[PDB]
Every structure is written in C-alpha cells, then in structure tokens.
Amino acid sequence: IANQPVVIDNGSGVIKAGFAGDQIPKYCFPNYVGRPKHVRVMAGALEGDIFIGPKAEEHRGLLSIRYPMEHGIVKDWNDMERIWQYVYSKDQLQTFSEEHPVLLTEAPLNPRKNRERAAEVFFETFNVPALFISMQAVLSLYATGRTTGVVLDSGDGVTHAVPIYEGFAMPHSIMRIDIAGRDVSRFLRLYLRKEGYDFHSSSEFEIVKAIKERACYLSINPQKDETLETEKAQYYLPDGSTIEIGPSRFRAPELLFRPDLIGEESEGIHEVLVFAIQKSDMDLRRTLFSNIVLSGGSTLFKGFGDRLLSEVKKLAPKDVKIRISAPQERLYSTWIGGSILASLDTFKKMWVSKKEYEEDGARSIHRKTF
Amino acid sequence: IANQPVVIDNGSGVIKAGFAGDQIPKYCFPNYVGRPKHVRVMAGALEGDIFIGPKAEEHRGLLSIRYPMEHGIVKDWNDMERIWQYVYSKDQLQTFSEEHPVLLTEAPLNPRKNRERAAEVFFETFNVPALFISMQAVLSLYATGRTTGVVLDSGDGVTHAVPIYEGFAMPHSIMRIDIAGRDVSRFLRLYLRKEGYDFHSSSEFEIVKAIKERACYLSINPQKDETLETEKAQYYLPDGSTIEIGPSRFRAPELLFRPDLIGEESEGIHEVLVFAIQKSDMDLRRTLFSNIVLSGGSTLFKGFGDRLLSEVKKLAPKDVKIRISAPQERLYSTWIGGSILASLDTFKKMWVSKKEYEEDGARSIHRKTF
Amino acid sequence: AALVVDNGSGMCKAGFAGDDAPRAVFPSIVGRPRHQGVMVGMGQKDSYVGDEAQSKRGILTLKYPIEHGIVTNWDDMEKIWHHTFYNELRVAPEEHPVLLTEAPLNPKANREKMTQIMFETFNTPAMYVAIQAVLSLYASGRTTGIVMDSGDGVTHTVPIYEGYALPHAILRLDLAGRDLTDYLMKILTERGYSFTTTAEREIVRDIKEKLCYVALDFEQEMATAASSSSLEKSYELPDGQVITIGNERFRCPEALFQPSFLGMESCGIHETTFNSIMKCDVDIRKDLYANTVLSGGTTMYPGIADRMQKEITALAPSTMKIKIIAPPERKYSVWIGGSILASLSTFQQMWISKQEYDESGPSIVHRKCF
Amino acid sequence: DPKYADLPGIARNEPDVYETSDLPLEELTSTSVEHIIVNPNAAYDKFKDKRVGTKGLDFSDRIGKTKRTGYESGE
Ligand SMILES: Nc1ncnc2c1ncn2[C@@H]1O[C@H](COP(=O)(O)OP(=O)(O)OP(=O)(O)O)[C@@H](O)[C@H]1O
Ligand SMILES: Nc1ncnc2c1ncn2[C@@H]1O[C@H](COP(=O)(O)OP(=O)(O)O)[C@@H](O)[C@H]1O
Ligand SMILES: Nc1ncnc2c1ncn2[C@@H]1O[C@H](COP(=O)(O)OP(=O)(O)O)[C@@H](O)[C@H]1O
C-alpha cells in the first residue's frame, strides 16, 4: 500500500511515533503503563485500570508506574500491546494500523525471540501491510547524513557502540552494555537517600528521573569537585517542597564512565566507544576516531562531550584526531533517521509483506533485517 | 596498426599499464582483488563486491585482500581476468581491448600452462588484435639502452638473473628462485610476532609490506650486526600506535641472501647472479661481470648494492672488474623497456595475430615467445 | 627430583617429575573483589587465586593473566606461581628445578621475562622452557608425526619427524577455547539467556565442556536441529534456573573448523593442519598423515577426531591413509610428556643452571630453548 | 532551527562538535651502484632501424632438426 509509512522508535524510556513525511516526531510519550496504586474495588476512583502517556502524567501520584521494556528487551508483552494500541489511538496519530506500513527500531544484539514476537503481534493483533525491524545505530547516521561513523547510542535501557564505515557495519566490533540512563536514575535514588530524601514509590521513581534530567552535570575531574564545597542547588518537587541535591548531583551520572564504583562489572561509556574502534581493522581506526556520533537521551548530560573527549583521548593513541559530532536533536535522532529511510523508494524492497510472512515462515523477518 | 599497442607489466606485487611511446607508465596500481569482509546494512554504501587498485587502497580496512598470482604463477585466473578487465575500465587507460594490441611481461622459466591460459584469456574474453609475451630481463636492457648485461630482477613474487650478451640471451644460463620481496614481508611478519606485535589480518599484512619498504636496511656484515645491541627505531602505524622493530629490521631482508632462514634449500640472490655468469661460456664471463643491471622493486632495500658488491666479489674470481649499474627508476625499468620495444616497427613482425593464434592454437604463442 | 609446571592460558597443570598425572590442576585466574568504600568483613584475602577464586566467583572479577599464550600481567602470573609451589604442590622452589611450557612462535620477551622471575624471585636451581607440542608426542610413545595441540589460549601445529622438528612448517592460530567460550555467549544471548560478567563467562565454559559436540556434516545437523528437538539438551546453572541451548550446542565448536563464524578471516583447525604438512618436505608427509595427534582440552570435544579425519582426507590425496591419534588423557597430554622428559637421565644436561644464567644473562634461554 | 525549537528535550546553548586541537631513496643515493638516467627517446632512436627475421622461428622445446636461434637477421 502506497499510504505513508508509520515510523515508531522502541525506546525503553520514551517511544517516539509519527509519519515518515514529518521532519520531527509529532507524538512522543513515556513508555510505561499506569494502573491505580490502591487496588480499586469501589466506584469514584480511576476507571479502566490503564493510563498511558499524557493521561498518566496528569494523575501520576495516584497511579503505579510499570515499565514494560527493560534493557532493550520486552518482559511483559500484554503491556507492550496496549502501548502500541495507544500509538494508534484518538490521542496520538488517529489512524488505522491496517492501512499504513510500520518500521520498528530494536537495539543491536537483542534476543531473536524478542524480534519474532514483535513481528507476530504487529502482523496478527494489528493487520499491518508490511513490517521492517532495523538497528537504532544505522538510522542515527541517515539523520546526520554521513555514511562512515561510529554511533555511541546511550538510551534509557541500553547503551551500545556500533562502528559503520562507508555503509558497512562490522557485526563483531559491536559493543553492548546494560548500564544505561535507567541505571543512572536508580543509582541517583540511592545517593538521594544518602542525602536523606527517600523516593521509595514507583511514581516517586519518575521524579528522580526528572531531577536527573533537570540537574546533573558531569565534572571533567570528579576528585576536585568532591573536595570543593557544593552550592547545594534547590530543586522544586510537584507538591511544592524543595530538596538540596548537593554532591549527589555530579557523582550520580559518573557511574556511566566508571560503573565499578557502585559494583557493576561493565566496561564504561568511554571504554565501549574506544574498544569498538580498536576491535575494528587497523586501517579504519583513524577514520572511526575522526567520525564519532552521539545518539540517545543519556548523552545530553551537561559536559558529557567534554568528559568523553578527555576520557577517550588518554585511552586512544597519541596525536590522533578525535571528533565527537553530536547533533542538536540527539534524543529524536534515531526516529529522524527512520523517517528519512522510510521516505526512500529502496525501503519498498526492504520491508516484509503480510503474505510473505504467512508463506516464507518465521525466518522472513530475521533474514530481511540486514 | 594506427592505434598504439598497450604495455601491461603483469607483476606479482604491482601491475603497471600504459600506452607505447609514453616515457613512464601513467596508471600503476597494486595487484590484488579486495572483497568486503564486513556486512552492508546502510543504503548509499560502496557499490560492488570487487574493489581493485586505488579504490581498494583508500578503503583497505573494510576489504579482505587476496593476491591472484604468487611466485610469478597465476593461482586464481577468475581474479586475474577481473584485474586485466579493470586496466581497460574507465578508472585507468579507458579504451576498448579490441582496438589496441597488447604486450604482456611474464617472468622467465614459468610453467607453459600459465603462458597458454594467459593467451586464451587475452584472445577469447578480450578480442585483442595481437599479443606478444616477453621476458622481464630482455626489456630492462632496452630501457637502459645497452646490448650486453646480466639483469638481476628481484620482483615481489620471483627473483631471476638472465645473462644477455650483444642481443642474444642464453636460455640454459637462466637462474630463477621463488624466494622474493613477498617472502621477506611474510618473514618480517613472523619476526614482528616474535617482537610481540600481531598482524594476522590480510589488510594488516599490507601494513607489514609498508613497514618493510620504509624501515629495513641490509647490513654489510651479518654476524657483526647480530651481536651489537641495535637502536630500537619506532614506526607509526596507520591508527597512531608506535612499534619498536629492533633486530627484525635488518634480519628480515637477509632472507634474499640466505634462503636457509625461512628453511628453503635454494641459492641466495648473490649466488644466483654469480652462478648465471659462471654457467655462461668462459669468454663472456668478464663482460657479464662488468655489465650487471639490477631491476625490480626488491633491489631498492637500503645497502642492497653495497652488500651484493661485497658478496659477489668473494664468490667471483680474483682481480675481475665488478660494476653493478642501477637505473634510477628500478621499479618501472621493466615497463619502459616494453614501451621502447612496442614503439619499434620490428614489433609488428614479432606479434601473434588473432587468425595466427586461432589456426595453430597454443603452439603459436610458445613458438614466438622466448 | 624435579617439578613440571604447564603454564596453560585456561588451566595451570603442576606436579612432580616421574608421576603418572599432575598433582594439582586449578584454573589459571586471579580474583580481585568488586569492593566499594564500605568496610569489608573478616577472613579477607586481598587477591584470590585458582580453586579459591573459582569458589568465590560471584563477587570477584576474574582476570586471565595469560592471553593467547602471552603473559600480559606478570604481577598476576607471579601470584599464580606462588599459589602453585608453596600452597598447591607444598614444595620449596629453591630445592627442586622447575620445567615450564611456552607455546611455539610466542614473543621473545615472554620466554625472557618468564625465566628472569624463576631465577630471581623464586631462586630456582635450574630452569628449562619447552614447546608444548614437542612434549605432547612423548605421551603417545611416538617420536615421528605432527600434533594439533589446541589449547584455551592458542592452537599450534608442530611437525616432528624421527625426533627432528621442522621450525618453518610451524603455524600458530589465535582461535582457541576462550574465543569459542566468547562466541558461545553471543549465540546464547541471541537465544535469550544473557551472560555478560567475568563470573558468568566461567559458567558458560562449564556449559561448553559438558554439552557441546562436533557435527560430521554441519548443514545436515542444522536441518535436524530445525525439524526435531532431539539435539536440544537441558543444563542446570549454579542457580536453580535451567536452560535449553538447542542448536547452539554444535554451532560453538563449528567455529574451530570455519573461523568465518568468529570473523577472523583465517584457515580452520583442519586446513592449518593440512597446510603445515604441505609446508614440510614431500617424503616425510606420508608419516605426518599417518601420525596426526590431537592434544590439549580443545580436542576433547565429542567427535572432533571423526570430523578432523573427514576434512583432512578431502584436502589430502586419495591414496594416502589419514589416522588421527586421540588418547584418553588429551587434557593432561602436555604435562605427562613433561614428566617423561624430566625423568630421562639425558635431560639432566639440557637444564640451564643459575651459574649459566648469572654469567650470560636472561638471553641464554633463546640459545637453550629448543 | 525552528524544527528543534518545537521539541521539548533538545540541547540549548551547547557546542555541536567536541573535537581535539588540530595538530599540523637511501639506496638510490649509494656509492656501490652506478646511477644511470633512463631516456627512452634516446633509446628509441638507437633501436629505431633494427629489424628481426621471424621466418623459420621456433623458441619452443622442439627436438626435431638440431639447434635453432630465434630472430635470424634484419632487412
Ligand atoms: N571435555 C572438554 N570438551 C570441550 N572443551 C573442553 C573440555 N575440557 C576443556 N575444554 C575447553 O578447552 C580448554 C582446555 O584447556 P586445558 O585444560 O587443555 O589447558 P590449556 O590452558 O589449554 O593448556 P595447554 O595450552 O598447555 O594445552 C578449557 O579451557 C575449556 O575451554
Ligand atoms: N535533557 C536530558 N538530560 C539528561 N538526561 C536526559 C535528557 N533527556 C533524556 N534524558 C535521559 O535519557 C532517557 C531518554 O532515552 P532515549 O533517547 O529516549 O532512548 P532511546 O534511544 O532508546 O529511545 C531519559 O529517560 C533520561 O534518562
Ligand atoms: N622502497 C622499497 N624498499 C624495499 N622493497 C621495496 C620498495 N618498494 C617496493 N619494494 C618491494 O618491491 C615490490 C615491487 O615489485 P615490482 O618490482 O613492482 O615487481 P615486478 O618486477 O614483478 O613487476 C613491492 O611489493 C615490495 O615488496
């Protein structure tokens, strides 16, 4: 069917939907299911037992937040079906899923059962004309408009580094670590309890993510800022109460660059970028250092590019040009890539038709992926 | 024929092509077929599964290198066909093969099946008017402009010595040994692993060839330089990392003079030259010792002329005048000879026509070559 | 009275010379704890080693000191040797002379620094380094024949005829047990079961050793794996959780026979064994086909011998008879050889003494290595 | 610019690019060997009027009728 394809980013934190024609995603809402915290027997309470996106944000304190997708993998599929149904609601897009074809953006090196079940839902529950699963990293390059480039895509659920040179992705050089934005939000809650402010509730976890997003700066030297006495910058909560964050502000997102501090066995965001380049062939190393692209929401931390440049330089070889080319629209970069890809006439060949999936089998989605 | 005949020096390391009359070969590119080892995911990436010459040199890290001819013997003919096709393509000379006659330059004492297939490809796949196969040594003498001389042509694939007196070349005094420049690069890689720097990849083997050309000197005394503690001269790799070569610098190129190191029971490059002269008749020995012409790229080693002149003098008779003459363009000397031979009207009689080849077959090529 | 100490990358096999099997066999690892700023409890060792670290895997970051038969961290290797002599064997290193094992074509600094420690740190009376492959032949009571000693660190092919080794015919391949263990993690992550941490990698090695087997026809095995669930076997983790690995069972050891899966762009363990025999002299090839030994624990995969025979036979001539030698004790094939060598009265002379080391230096080892 | 002004979660007053400071034959001069200058134009003239006799030519390993010498004479 010729009618405009619907791009949808499967972001663990925020799913971004919209049409391929639009330069930006019109409808982007948080990826969580909202049910009433108190188990509702009585009338005059929150009805439906389902609150998604803007409806949830309004009555947030009353509801109990449960993320359906963890570490770029779908844990509860029933929840994810309701989320994708809300994408084709009167609230967002307001269209038939049966008419328009779909593009998914699954993280690299995900389970094959995750891709197979994702297709089954979108072909059976929704009567889609055609579906195409793609890598988040490959899209990010289409948006910026360069063929060569390493893509350090720091999402909410997973942070992954994929090196692609002249439209060729080395699949062995891909690096994936689970320590992402959501873990930084979890570790900030621990340090906020060490400052003396508890956020025990699942609703109260959402305002820790807001505190992180508002006020958390990455110091170039962490040891100097610790010895220096903090200003203790006040943050205002939804109720109106003030909280002085203090040293927790800067030593929370540090755990990205040094995850051994809390006690998580991972490489680190500076390390995975360098290791991904060093794993690739010697001839390409210089060009891959010379073309680095930051993607996702967990790069927007104040002074992230400043710290990463410094942490990469000392690990990388001496007298090598390191350009970390961040776009202005890092959060919405992954979708814009899909929107451009979808618009091209080549995409018509790439996607798998509904009749193709019935005849060919299950492999059809996997083999056409690349 | 009005259209100029094309000279193609089918060298193991570098194939040099151009039109007859030209003072230097216009289009000289490395002899290998580059195929992409990494997977293509993005749209707009480098087109084709075959990369040859300068496009392959630029995107070397992406591709897996595969040499078609080894020790002056075409192992894979499908690949040899694609490189000869690339010579006639738009990137290099950019002319039809059917309009221009060809001059091919094979090594001496190669298998007869090689010359037969070389002709079969150049007459059937390309409909060339005329093909003449010639020895590398005979051409090298035309370039320098001398009738008498022994030509020690140390190429990438094979090193051979051909004694030629007043136009005639003595076929029984021809000396050929497989050990050459590419075995020195292979022997250098082995010693670099002993030093503790690994170059397993086919792309990384081209960096070992670059290390050999830049930093490797032949010591005048081998046993002396072995004992003395050497200055560990650092070399900068493409990525930026520094390697200390140390003793492997001077031990690697000694392979040419001592084939026992790699473990092949053959004559040394110094033994090849004197044996070729000593095999020739008593009268001509003094004139051949006086007129020595070095050719090929593997003679460009620092202190090759100094070492050879030392080694030849010991094996040669006492009180004989040994003058080793080097043309400044050692690498291109073979081709320039081809251009001068091709420009002469006598070359018209020397050619094998299509009709002449079609009638007799393989025999016609074997009859007219040396 | 003498000590044999195999310094394998996977497991360190140590014992007394003359004994049938090695006394103490433990995994060669150093376990440093994921410590926070919180104070630690009692009975705390700063760095755990071997069976102790294998018991306390949960918290300790497992760091293999030998990577591809090259000692990266010497301070770590020193702590293993200290656990080997004093704790495991219960013997003074000053009393007994120590035989160590190095893989062939290792960096020269490895053998140099190895012996320096044994002579200075431990103050051993004598020290001899030997090639693992040379020892492995003594196990089978065979002087003649090639060996394919595939270890956890490296795999090497050393052809030895009538008690004389061919050094130039020796070929080293970096593909080994640890690369297969790393490969098995990736394909298990594709199924669903994610293993990231260093402790988890050790559990994946236990899964590999027990279940994984070599298929005769890979394409035929993949067809049966797709259709029927007969090959699918269950394994219980340290946690009560059980996993069904399926087709990935026989997919892991396939990487040995075709490195393209791992993406090394190198010849398989079958093809390198053939290539090594072809590099040797034409006469002796007969006996090397007739006496092809498989050594190390990477040749204890069920049905590797059958697959090895098939692949060699296809490459080798039809007239030749190819017999693969697979003794029951392949894991302890390197050590049991060392025990036979050390016991022989002839070997008493070949030992390098302290007096010999003191006068000459650590460079003496390169002369009296093999 | 006006596209990214519409969206909420966008980088404002931040540098787009984080980059490092932009940092700015031995054998062919040997005594042993005698360096000759290759002039093909001169060489071409010397061989210009030299011909070869391809009549009764056979370089091949053919035993019949004694020894042979390819390229008999010119003119
Ligand atoms: N029965 C088995 N089946 C399959 N793989 C095995 C088996 N036993 C061990 N392995 C694997 O192969 C490796 C064998 O290591 P081994 O005990 O031979 O020591 P090593 O470090 O390889 O020593 P060396 O290099 O001297 O042989 C193990 O690390 C493991 O990954
Ligand atoms: N302006 C910001 N400053 C700091 N962190 C941010 C900012 N915006 C988003 N984040 C973090 O990044 C997450 C968004 O990740 P996102 O880019 O949507 O991932 P994905 O690429 O998987 O869709 C948020 O949940 C939050 O943790
Ligand atoms: N400067 C140099 N020093 C040493 N070796 C060199 C140098 N330049 C080229 N070589 C060697 O010579 C080879 C070139 O051989 P070449 O003369 O082109 O072959 P052929 O004579 O068969 O056409 C290179 O591949 C390399 O091994």
PDB file of C-alpha atoms in Angstrom, chain A residues 136-293:
ATOM      1  CA  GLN A 136      18.974   2.004  16.132  1.00  0.00           C
ATOM      2  CA  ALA A 137      22.665   2.805  15.246  1.00  0.00           C
ATOM      3  CA  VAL A 138      22.259   2.578  11.388  1.00  0.00           C
ATOM      4  CA  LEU A 139      19.306   5.095  11.477  1.00  0.00           C
ATOM      5  CA  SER A 140      21.324   7.718  13.511  1.00  0.00           C
ATOM      6  CA  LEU A 141      23.786   8.045  10.529  1.00  0.00           C
ATOM      7  CA  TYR A 142      20.925   8.678   7.967  1.00  0.00           C
ATOM      8  CA  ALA A 143      19.690  11.615  10.182  1.00  0.00           C
ATOM      9  CA  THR A 144      23.168  13.317  10.388  1.00  0.00           C
ATOM     10  CA  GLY A 145      23.739  12.476   6.654  1.00  0.00           C
ATOM     11  CA  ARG A 146      27.159  10.673   6.721  1.00  0.00           C
ATOM     12  CA  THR A 147      27.907   7.051   5.547  1.00  0.00           C
ATOM     13  CA  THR A 148      31.015   6.461   7.780  1.00  0.00           C
ATOM     14  CA  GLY A 149      30.647   6.980  11.586  1.00  0.00           C
ATOM     15  CA  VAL A 150      30.679   5.157  14.985  1.00  0.00           C
ATOM     16  CA  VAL A 151      27.300   5.607  16.833  1.00  0.00           C
ATOM     17  CA  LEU A 152      27.539   5.692  20.691  1.00  0.00           C
ATOM     18  CA  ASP A 153      23.717   5.446  21.268  1.00  0.00           C
ATOM     19  CA  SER A 154      23.164   5.886  25.078  1.00  0.00           C
ATOM     20  CA  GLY A 155      19.417   5.112  25.595  1.00  0.00           C
ATOM     21  CA  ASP A 156      17.387   4.703  28.852  1.00  0.00           C
ATOM     22  CA  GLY A 157      17.521   0.837  28.824  1.00  0.00           C
ATOM     23  CA  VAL A 158      20.793   0.027  26.915  1.00  0.00           C
ATOM     24  CA  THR A 159      23.960   1.932  25.757  1.00  0.00           C
ATOM     25  CA  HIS A 160      25.565   0.413  22.569  1.00  0.00           C
ATOM     26  CA  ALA A 161      28.501   1.423  20.262  1.00  0.00           C
ATOM     27  CA  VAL A 162      28.262   0.279  16.557  1.00  0.00           C
ATOM     28  CA  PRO A 163      31.111   1.138  14.110  1.00  0.00           C
ATOM     29  CA  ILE A 164      29.858   1.596  10.458  1.00  0.00           C
ATOM     30  CA  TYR A 165      32.404   2.559   7.691  1.00  0.00           C
ATOM     31  CA  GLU A 166      31.258   3.649   4.146  1.00  0.00           C
ATOM     32  CA  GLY A 167      27.866   1.864   4.636  1.00  0.00           C
ATOM     33  CA  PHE A 168      29.420  -1.375   6.072  1.00  0.00           C
ATOM     34  CA  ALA A 169      28.677  -2.326   9.747  1.00  0.00           C
ATOM     35  CA  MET A 170      31.253  -4.756  11.304  1.00  0.00           C
ATOM     36  CA  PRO A 171      28.933  -7.062  13.353  1.00  0.00           C
ATOM     37  CA  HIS A 172      31.817  -8.456  15.558  1.00  0.00           C
ATOM     38  CA  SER A 173      33.001  -4.891  16.544  1.00  0.00           C
ATOM     39  CA  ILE A 174      29.502  -4.034  18.043  1.00  0.00           C
ATOM     40  CA  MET A 175      29.655  -3.499  21.872  1.00  0.00           C
ATOM     41  CA  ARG A 176      26.542  -3.615  24.185  1.00  0.00           C
ATOM     42  CA  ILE A 177      26.409  -2.858  27.980  1.00  0.00           C
ATOM     43  CA  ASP A 178      23.209  -2.762  30.157  1.00  0.00           C
ATOM     44  CA  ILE A 179      24.406   0.234  32.347  1.00  0.00           C
ATOM     45  CA  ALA A 180      22.202   2.984  30.743  1.00  0.00           C
ATOM     46  CA  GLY A 181      20.079   6.064  31.764  1.00  0.00           C
ATOM     47  CA  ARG A 182      17.636   3.893  33.838  1.00  0.00           C
ATOM     48  CA  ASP A 183      20.570   2.551  35.987  1.00  0.00           C
ATOM     49  CA  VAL A 184      21.807   6.208  36.468  1.00  0.00           C
ATOM     50  CA  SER A 185      18.229   7.071  37.693  1.00  0.00           C
ATOM     51  CA  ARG A 186      18.369   4.002  40.067  1.00  0.00           C
ATOM     52  CA  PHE A 187      21.865   4.978  41.439  1.00  0.00           C
ATOM     53  CA  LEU A 188      20.756   8.672  41.848  1.00  0.00           C
ATOM     54  CA  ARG A 189      17.823   7.439  44.076  1.00  0.00           C
ATOM     55  CA  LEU A 190      20.417   5.609  46.308  1.00  0.00           C
ATOM     56  CA  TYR A 191      22.620   8.796  46.612  1.00  0.00           C
ATOM     57  CA  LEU A 192      19.425  10.903  47.267  1.00  0.00           C
ATOM     58  CA  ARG A 193      18.692   8.514  50.237  1.00  0.00           C
ATOM     59  CA  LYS A 194      22.390   9.127  51.259  1.00  0.00           C
ATOM     60  CA  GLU A 195      21.485  12.908  51.184  1.00  0.00           C
ATOM     61  CA  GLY A 196      18.354  11.964  53.259  1.00  0.00           C
ATOM     62  CA  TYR A 197      15.451  12.098  50.689  1.00  0.00           C
ATOM     63  CA  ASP A 198      13.613   8.736  50.104  1.00  0.00           C
ATOM     64  CA  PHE A 199      11.794   8.052  46.746  1.00  0.00           C
ATOM     65  CA  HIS A 200      10.522   4.513  47.663  1.00  0.00           C
ATOM     66  CA  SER A 201       7.351   4.585  45.417  1.00  0.00           C
ATOM     67  CA  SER A 202       7.321   3.664  41.652  1.00  0.00           C
ATOM     68  CA  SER A 203       5.621   7.085  40.998  1.00  0.00           C
ATOM     69  CA  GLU A 204       8.404   8.736  43.138  1.00  0.00           C
ATOM     70  CA  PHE A 205      10.999   6.976  40.834  1.00  0.00           C
ATOM     71  CA  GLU A 206       9.638   9.139  37.915  1.00  0.00           C
ATOM     72  CA  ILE A 207      10.530  12.446  39.750  1.00  0.00           C
ATOM     73  CA  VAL A 208      14.108  11.064  40.412  1.00  0.00           C
ATOM     74  CA  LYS A 209      14.319  10.704  36.552  1.00  0.00           C
ATOM     75  CA  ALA A 210      13.048  14.365  36.340  1.00  0.00           C
ATOM     76  CA  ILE A 211      15.657  15.525  38.993  1.00  0.00           C
ATOM     77  CA  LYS A 212      18.403  13.710  36.938  1.00  0.00           C
ATOM     78  CA  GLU A 213      17.178  15.263  33.607  1.00  0.00           C
ATOM     79  CA  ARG A 214      16.946  18.792  35.213  1.00  0.00           C
ATOM     80  CA  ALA A 215      20.125  18.994  37.413  1.00  0.00           C
ATOM     81  CA  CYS A 216      23.102  16.562  36.928  1.00  0.00           C
ATOM     82  CA  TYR A 217      26.449  17.868  35.472  1.00  0.00           C
ATOM     83  CA  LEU A 218      29.473  15.619  34.577  1.00  0.00           C
ATOM     84  CA  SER A 219      32.668  17.147  36.145  1.00  0.00           C
ATOM     85  CA  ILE A 220      35.885  16.941  33.983  1.00  0.00           C
ATOM     86  CA  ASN A 221      37.812  15.954  37.193  1.00  0.00           C
ATOM     87  CA  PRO A 222      35.498  14.170  39.723  1.00  0.00           C
ATOM     88  CA  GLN A 223      38.057  14.236  42.647  1.00  0.00           C
ATOM     89  CA  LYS A 224      38.439  18.111  42.579  1.00  0.00           C
ATOM     90  CA  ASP A 225      34.608  18.754  42.662  1.00  0.00           C
ATOM     91  CA  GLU A 226      34.261  16.344  45.691  1.00  0.00           C
ATOM     92  CA  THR A 227      36.895  18.304  47.773  1.00  0.00           C
ATOM     93  CA  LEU A 228      35.251  21.656  46.692  1.00  0.00           C
ATOM     94  CA  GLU A 229      32.199  22.639  48.866  1.00  0.00           C
ATOM     95  CA  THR A 230      28.957  22.399  46.760  1.00  0.00           C
ATOM     96  CA  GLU A 231      26.387  25.257  46.308  1.00  0.00           C
ATOM     97  CA  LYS A 232      23.553  22.717  47.107  1.00  0.00           C
ATOM     98  CA  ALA A 233      21.203  23.866  44.258  1.00  0.00           C
ATOM     99  CA  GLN A 234      17.482  23.625  45.294  1.00  0.00           C
ATOM    100  CA  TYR A 235      15.063  21.575  43.068  1.00  0.00           C
ATOM    101  CA  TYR A 236      11.228  22.084  43.332  1.00  0.00           C
ATOM    102  CA  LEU A 237       9.040  18.887  43.505  1.00  0.00           C
ATOM    103  CA  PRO A 238       5.441  18.542  42.133  1.00  0.00           C
ATOM    104  CA  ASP A 239       3.895  19.021  45.668  1.00  0.00           C
ATOM    105  CA  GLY A 240       5.952  22.291  46.047  1.00  0.00           C
ATOM    106  CA  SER A 241       8.587  21.072  48.616  1.00  0.00           C
ATOM    107  CA  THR A 242      12.305  21.960  47.967  1.00  0.00           C
ATOM    108  CA  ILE A 243      15.256  19.440  48.049  1.00  0.00           C
ATOM    109  CA  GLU A 244      19.001  20.428  48.182  1.00  0.00           C
ATOM    110  CA  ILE A 245      20.738  17.749  45.976  1.00  0.00           C
ATOM    111  CA  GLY A 246      24.376  18.861  46.655  1.00  0.00           C
ATOM    112  CA  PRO A 247      27.199  16.368  45.824  1.00  0.00           C
ATOM    113  CA  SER A 248      24.739  13.598  44.624  1.00  0.00           C
ATOM    114  CA  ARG A 249      24.118  15.858  41.517  1.00  0.00           C
ATOM    115  CA  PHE A 250      27.553  15.191  39.835  1.00  0.00           C
ATOM    116  CA  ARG A 251      28.655  11.794  41.389  1.00  0.00           C
ATOM    117  CA  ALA A 252      25.429  10.046  40.092  1.00  0.00           C
ATOM    118  CA  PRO A 253      26.000  10.182  36.257  1.00  0.00           C
ATOM    119  CA  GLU A 254      29.790   9.491  36.830  1.00  0.00           C
ATOM    120  CA  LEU A 255      28.723   5.763  37.183  1.00  0.00           C
ATOM    121  CA  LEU A 256      28.259   5.696  33.333  1.00  0.00           C
ATOM    122  CA  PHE A 257      32.035   6.394  32.855  1.00  0.00           C
ATOM    123  CA  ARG A 258      33.082   4.264  35.934  1.00  0.00           C
ATOM    124  CA  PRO A 259      30.490   1.527  36.768  1.00  0.00           C
ATOM    125  CA  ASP A 260      32.930  -0.331  39.163  1.00  0.00           C
ATOM    126  CA  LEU A 261      32.263   2.390  41.872  1.00  0.00           C
ATOM    127  CA  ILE A 262      28.732   1.062  42.782  1.00  0.00           C
ATOM    128  CA  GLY A 263      29.873  -2.544  41.957  1.00  0.00           C
ATOM    129  CA  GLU A 264      28.587  -3.334  38.397  1.00  0.00           C
ATOM    130  CA  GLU A 265      31.039  -5.382  36.208  1.00  0.00           C
ATOM    131  CA  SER A 266      30.931  -3.368  32.900  1.00  0.00           C
ATOM    132  CA  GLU A 267      33.451  -1.592  30.566  1.00  0.00           C
ATOM    133  CA  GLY A 268      32.074   2.013  30.750  1.00  0.00           C
ATOM    134  CA  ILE A 269      30.766   4.534  28.134  1.00  0.00           C
ATOM    135  CA  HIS A 270      34.299   5.917  27.321  1.00  0.00           C
ATOM    136  CA  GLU A 271      35.652   2.288  27.165  1.00  0.00           C
ATOM    137  CA  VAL A 272      32.920   0.709  24.879  1.00  0.00           C
ATOM    138  CA  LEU A 273      33.467   3.558  22.297  1.00  0.00           C
ATOM    139  CA  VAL A 274      37.316   3.036  22.203  1.00  0.00           C
ATOM    140  CA  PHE A 275      37.079  -0.838  22.383  1.00  0.00           C
ATOM    141  CA  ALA A 276      34.556  -0.844  19.433  1.00  0.00           C
ATOM    142  CA  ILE A 277      37.096   1.196  17.314  1.00  0.00           C
ATOM    143  CA  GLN A 278      40.143  -0.906  18.498  1.00  0.00           C
ATOM    144  CA  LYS A 279      38.209  -4.196  17.734  1.00  0.00           C
ATOM    145  CA  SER A 280      37.748  -2.973  14.075  1.00  0.00           C
ATOM    146  CA  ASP A 281      40.557  -3.240  11.418  1.00  0.00           C
ATOM    147  CA  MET A 282      43.717  -1.035  11.850  1.00  0.00           C
ATOM    148  CA  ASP A 283      43.212   0.947   8.541  1.00  0.00           C
ATOM    149  CA  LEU A 284      39.707   2.200   9.636  1.00  0.00           C
ATOM    150  CA  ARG A 285      40.665   3.114  13.298  1.00  0.00           C
ATOM    151  CA  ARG A 286      41.798   6.699  12.335  1.00  0.00           C
ATOM    152  CA  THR A 287      38.597   7.469  10.271  1.00  0.00           C
ATOM    153  CA  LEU A 288      36.311   5.920  13.000  1.00  0.00           C
ATOM    154  CA  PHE A 289      38.001   8.114  15.718  1.00  0.00           C
ATOM    155  CA  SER A 290      37.624  11.080  13.244  1.00  0.00           C
ATOM    156  CA  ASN A 291      33.826  10.302  12.887  1.00  0.00           C
ATOM    157  CA  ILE A 292      32.028   9.608  16.252  1.00  0.00           C
ATOM    158  CA  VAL A 293      28.239  10.405  16.560  1.00  0.00           C
TER     159      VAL A 293
END
